[PDB]
Design a protein around this ligand. Sequence first.
Ligand SMILES: [Ca+2]
Ligand SMILES: [Ca+2]
Ligand SMILES: [Mg+2]
Lengths: 129, 450, 168
Amino acid sequence: STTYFNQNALTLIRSLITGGATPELELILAEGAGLRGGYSTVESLSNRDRCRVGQISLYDGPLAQFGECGKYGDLFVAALKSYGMLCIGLYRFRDTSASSKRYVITNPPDDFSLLPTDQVFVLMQFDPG
Amino acid sequence: FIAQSCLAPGFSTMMANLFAMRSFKTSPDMQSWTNDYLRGTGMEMYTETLSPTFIGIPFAQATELCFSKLKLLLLAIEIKSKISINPRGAKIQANTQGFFIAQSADEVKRAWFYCKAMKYDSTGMFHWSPAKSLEDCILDRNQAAMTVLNGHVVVCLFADPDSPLIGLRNLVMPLRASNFHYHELKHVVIVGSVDYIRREWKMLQNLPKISVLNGSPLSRADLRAVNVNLCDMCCILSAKVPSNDDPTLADKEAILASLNIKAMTFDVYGANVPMITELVNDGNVQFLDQDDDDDPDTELYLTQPFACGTAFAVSVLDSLMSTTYFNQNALTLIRSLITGGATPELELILAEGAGLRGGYSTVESLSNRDRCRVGQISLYDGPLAQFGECGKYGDLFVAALKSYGMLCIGLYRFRDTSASSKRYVITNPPDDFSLLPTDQVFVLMQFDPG
Amino acid sequence: LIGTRAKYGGTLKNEKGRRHIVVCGHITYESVSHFLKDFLHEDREDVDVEVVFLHRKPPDLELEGLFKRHFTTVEFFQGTIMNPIDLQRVKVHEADACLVLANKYCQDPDAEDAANIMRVISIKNYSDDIRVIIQLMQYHNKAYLLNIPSWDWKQGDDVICLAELKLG
Ligand SMILES: [Ca+2]
Ligand SMILES: [Ca+2]
Ligand SMILES: [Mg+2]
């Protein structure tokens, strides 16, 4: 149902979860010879520069300051300016008092209160080196 | 019929319609190409005793006279007894039985009421080889890629290792007839599972120029290895048993293989590759072509893919048994026309169980190589190209008969003269028919030694 | 022997400035109810697109009641997508898109994929410029659809591969 209303919606999902599967890659695979390698060129290394799905922890590091006080809006802005990472949601412990089970909170409001033991879903940029 | 289509595309449609009895009457208004094709479908084969006036003249003058005067096409006669198709330098004897192509049995009565007022096998009809093994014929993708394959025949085979055996020998032997010189023999490459072909190799040991490539015809990598873009004909056959779950799903593999080649691109499109497909269910012919109107209760012979010589089915052979009862010699003519010459002695040797048996060439054994064969010619260039520009079937028929002895049976004409590379079959057009420079003619050409 | 007249049959009535889609494949009460809840949701943009369902077996009592509750926006017709006559009845050539549902809980994924691929061939045979969205079970069957001459991802043809998406 989502695909019919917007074709580009399915394209975004496939690029997000398959690591990048261009239609030309599917054409090569449809031949039947399997995955085909290639020699790296000037642009071929530029295709490596794209965002990837990752998870970060607020327990330590420069972003750990927002975990102590707690404000999703402040963390979202600071992460975007410092490294370009885009925060999508949170991975928060089910009980704050004792099981190691975390549930998913998608796009919390900017006034949401963070915790030092919170994990953030982020889209981190590619860093060469 | 499939094997003969490799030498002359569209021959399966022409031959299948000959022995299906249809009555043709002109429609008020419809497509011009449909009208021309429908007229050809009304022609059948009839046997009639030749008039005593024909006694003492050669066959070439007899068939030319019948075409010009009686408006009948005479292609074979019975000689005391064997049947000769377009014989060269054969006189007409008393009460000679002739084979005619006409609209009905009333037309052939005009013929009676006429007045002036180790290289070859034991039989010497097929080429022979000293029993090459299957292992030596197995090629992989790299082996097939670095060998030149031009004008060959690709057999796309869908068969499980336990699938019932088909007559794979019945497809290769007509391509290995003694009518063809060794240099002009078409290479045959079979794409399919080696396990199935292993059971079929008993009757293919002694047939020259046979290659087997393991894999599936659906894969584009295998098809590019055998150069399907340069093949003379690609045949898609399925030996798998039908699951009987749904009639529309019976030809799923054959339809997919045909569509895959059509969309294939070569550094020349794949839509120009000549293809023949056999359907286990004649109702699946609607999916073979895209630029046509499909209607479920239309007969198979009326469909565009069949009229173009692209599809084939065993349902069109059901009328042979009625034809055989009325005239036994009718079936003999068909078998000699499509099997490349299969004498009863050859079948006796095969029935022993030792496979094809070779023989040493003798004085007469090389004379068996002199017989007519099914072929196709083009009017685009050559001495006969003059008739293409002006256009007259009667003039072309007479000129070809005198110059080389070739007998014209029909035409392979483009469906649209204004842009698709699809040609339909016109069987025995009238002498006043107008030809085109892009027309192909079905002919029975004589054997030329050398 | 007289029985009852065919409740579901005939041609879909033509309307001026009307948009509709054709949904075929695995048409059951659970699949239709789940599809209709997502398709007709007031959280999304308001569009006047009605759903036309085509299936071989007649619907059961539960499915018939569901169609009654969506009388003004959902239509059902009895027939097979492999029949060119039935494609004319649902007016595939005038449809915005054709959706091919798949039976995810099937004993043989290869058999299910082959049947759905033939449905796309039948739709493309009737007309080439029709958007087709098909649910596919296995990725190795996606090559067959890509090799179809009329398949064009530029024009909106999409394959939803459950195996590729689930493992992704
Ligand atoms: Ca007739
Ligand atoms: Ca068609
Ligand atoms: Mg006939």
